[PDB]
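User: I'm putting together a teaching handout on how multi-component assemblies are represented. Below are the sequence lines for each component of a complex, exactly as they appear in our records. Could you produce the 3D structure of the whole assembly as structure tokens, so the students can see both representations side by side? Please keep the chain order the same as the input.
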Amino acid sequence: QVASGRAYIHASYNNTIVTITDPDGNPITWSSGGVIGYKGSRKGTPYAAQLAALDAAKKAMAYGMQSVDVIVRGTGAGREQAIRALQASGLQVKSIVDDTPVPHNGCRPKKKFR
Amino acid sequence: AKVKATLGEFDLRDYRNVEVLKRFLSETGKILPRRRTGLSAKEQRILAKTIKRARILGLLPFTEKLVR
Amino acid sequence: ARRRRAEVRQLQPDLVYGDVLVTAFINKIMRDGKKNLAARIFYDACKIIQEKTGQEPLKVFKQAVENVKPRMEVRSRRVGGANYQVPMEVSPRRQQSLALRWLVQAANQRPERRAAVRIAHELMDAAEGKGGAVKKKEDVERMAEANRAYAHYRW
RNA sequence: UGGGAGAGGGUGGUGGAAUUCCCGGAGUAGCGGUGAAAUGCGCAGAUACCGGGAGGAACGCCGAUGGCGAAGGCAGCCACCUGGUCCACCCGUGACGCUGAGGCGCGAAAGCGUGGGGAGCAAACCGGAUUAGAUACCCGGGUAGUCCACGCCCUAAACGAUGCGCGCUAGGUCUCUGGGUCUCCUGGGGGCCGAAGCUAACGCGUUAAGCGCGCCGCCUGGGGAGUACGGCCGCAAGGC
Ligand SMILES: [Mg+2]
Ligand SMILES: [Mg+2]
Ligand SMILES: [Mg+2]
Ligand SMILES: [Mg+2]
Ligand SMILES: [Mg+2]
Ligand SMILES: [Mg+2]
Ligand SMILES: [Mg+2]
Ligand SMILES: [Mg+2]
Ligand SMILES: [Mg+2]
Ligand SMILES: [Mg+2]
Ligand SMILES: [Mg+2]
Ligand SMILES: [Mg+2]
Ligand SMILES: [Mg+2]
Ligand SMILES: [Mg+2]
Ligand SMILES: [Mg+2]
Ligand SMILES: [Mg+2]
Ligand SMILES: [Mg+2]
Ligand SMILES: [Mg+2]
Ligand SMILES: [Mg+2]
Ligand SMILES: [Mg+2]
Ligand SMILES: [Mg+2]
Ligand SMILES: [Mg+2]
Ligand SMILES: [Mg+2]
Ligand SMILES: [Mg+2]
Ligand SMILES: [Mg+2]
Ligand SMILES: [Mg+2]
Ligand SMILES: [Mg+2]
Ligand SMILES: [Mg+2]
Ligand SMILES: [Mg+2]
Ligand SMILES: [Mg+2]
Ligand SMILES: [Mg+2]
Ligand SMILES: [Mg+2]
Ligand SMILES: [Mg+2]
Ligand SMILES: [Mg+2]
Ligand SMILES: [Mg+2]
Ligand SMILES: [Mg+2]
Ligand SMILES: [Mg+2]
Ligand SMILES: [Mg+2]
Ligand SMILES: [Mg+2]
Ligand SMILES: [Mg+2]
Ligand SMILES: [Mg+2]
Ligand SMILES: [Mg+2]
Ligand SMILES: [Mg+2]
Ligand SMILES: [Mg+2]
Ligand SMILES: [Mg+2]
Ligand SMILES: [Mg+2]
Ligand SMILES: [Mg+2]
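Assistant: Of course. Below is the structure of the complete assembly, with chains in the same order as your input.
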């Protein structure tokens, strides 16, 4: 059981996934739009993400989670709402940092990304 | 809030002056535009070129995470 | 329509209860512009909801109404290529209209033979939480709940 | 002679971000994708998360309406080798100039030969959808190729659809880079609006499409046709 930990948000246009880890970085539990119960396009919605971060927080609290640090990746439309859900969840939110991977003109993207 | 103003006489070509240079980077690590640095056309290139040099030398970051 | 928001018509209060809300319920009963016939049936119901339950019809009626008001409804809006059932709050003006219409429609589903009786019986079960009108309200309420994910599509 | 600016070119090194694969930890019911789905991937442990390793390719912020080059074109960083060019001084040569049929070189992308390399992407091809059909558009895959060396090909909306040099014909403003005394003046580039004048109009206008001289290239109704025949070039595709 861990009091302080990490909160990772992978939120894309198609879905939002939330994983709660220990301060070492080992996941303790995770959730997503599918885990809450949605399918198809509904997974990408803000409301889906809200439920996701919660179920991610609820399970986390049950293992002794109190404090978290929120790490954000992805520019989805359900992003900020995930952040809202974690604060109003009963978790500490000691910090919130966006760490979306951006290349320095690395690999050529797919056709739809040019 | 132009950075060029808030400093005295300083060398643009000086890649080991980490304390001067660190002021020219954004909180996210990116090199700041002229509209923020107050440098002229010619000065910007000298600045940019030496900032990159320093990054290789470990004195300056290539990127830094965005805290809220 | 397009130009400006139209004005809401205030009904001439009923002569038995001096109530603007009762007048509305009357008019929805009115077929073919025969109001007097609609007046009896409703007032007859006031008689019936007194006998089979010893208390104020106006209290029966009004409380029954509140139990039929939907707080959330779903309004269709085909965004993209699919028809989305967007959840929407209901303005009190519409909450009234939908409760009354359903209340009378739920009445006309019942098997009892006289109109006077049905209106009574539905208004009887409505304040007590039952009846087809309340069935429809709960339905429309869960539908808006079910589609809570389309909260961001609201107008 | 002295000075400057720049992704000009070539060789060798080298730095971080990211994608992919692989190893370990931890973790569980889905992930992915779309207009919505499905194919696909996942309890044989995926996604998401942390640590490590491997490999290729492109260099984010700076970055610009910017700079450089004859054009094609050129962008992380360092060093070496190297071209063009501008300014100031007004020292040297004494018309040594301009253009240029042939010739010669250079020439994006795709393409070809031999040998490397191969992460991402992606013709062809396979699958899932859509559809009346969908040999497409969208989605899951995916081989050439994209990368390097050497040698071929020599095409284009290779465009400013504007050949090069030179003299003369108001200015106003933004910008890059030099020199003065630096208010500003004076050069050389990059745009915008405009005197005169041009033009069929649109628009051009000291970066002329204005007014003039020199030289080269080219046009002469549409299609047939950049086809045929011949010739020259090419491994072929094909080019002239
Ligand atoms: Mg999705
Ligand atoms: Mg120095
Ligand atoms: Mg009904
Ligand atoms: Mg010299
Ligand atoms: Mg593993
Ligand atoms: Mg990792
Ligand atoms: Mg840029
Ligand atoms: Mg002299
Ligand atoms: Mg002499
Ligand atoms: Mg010549
Ligand atoms: Mg020739
Ligand atoms: Mg070529
Ligand atoms: Mg090529
Ligand atoms: Mg080949
Ligand atoms: Mg080859
Ligand atoms: Mg062969
Ligand atoms: Mg090969
Ligand atoms: Mg491959
Ligand atoms: Mg197919
Ligand atoms: Mg089919
Ligand atoms: Mg067929
Ligand atoms: Mg595809
Ligand atoms: Mg692919
Ligand atoms: Mg082949
Ligand atoms: Mg081959
Ligand atoms: Mg072939
Ligand atoms: Mg071109
Ligand atoms: Mg062009
Ligand atoms: Mg030109
Ligand atoms: Mg031509
Ligand atoms: Mg023409
Ligand atoms: Mg010529
Ligand atoms: Mg000067
Ligand atoms: Mg000029
Ligand atoms: Mg003009
Ligand atoms: Mg005129
Ligand atoms: Mg003329
Ligand atoms: Mg005209
Ligand atoms: Mg001018
Ligand atoms: Mg010029
Ligand atoms: Mg003309
Ligand atoms: Mg003819
Ligand atoms: Mg002809
Ligand atoms: Mg031919
Ligand atoms: Mg041809
Ligand atoms: Mg022939
Ligand atoms: Mg030709």
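A couple of points students might notice: The radius of gyration of chain C is 17 Å. Strands of chain C lie at 72-77, 84-89.
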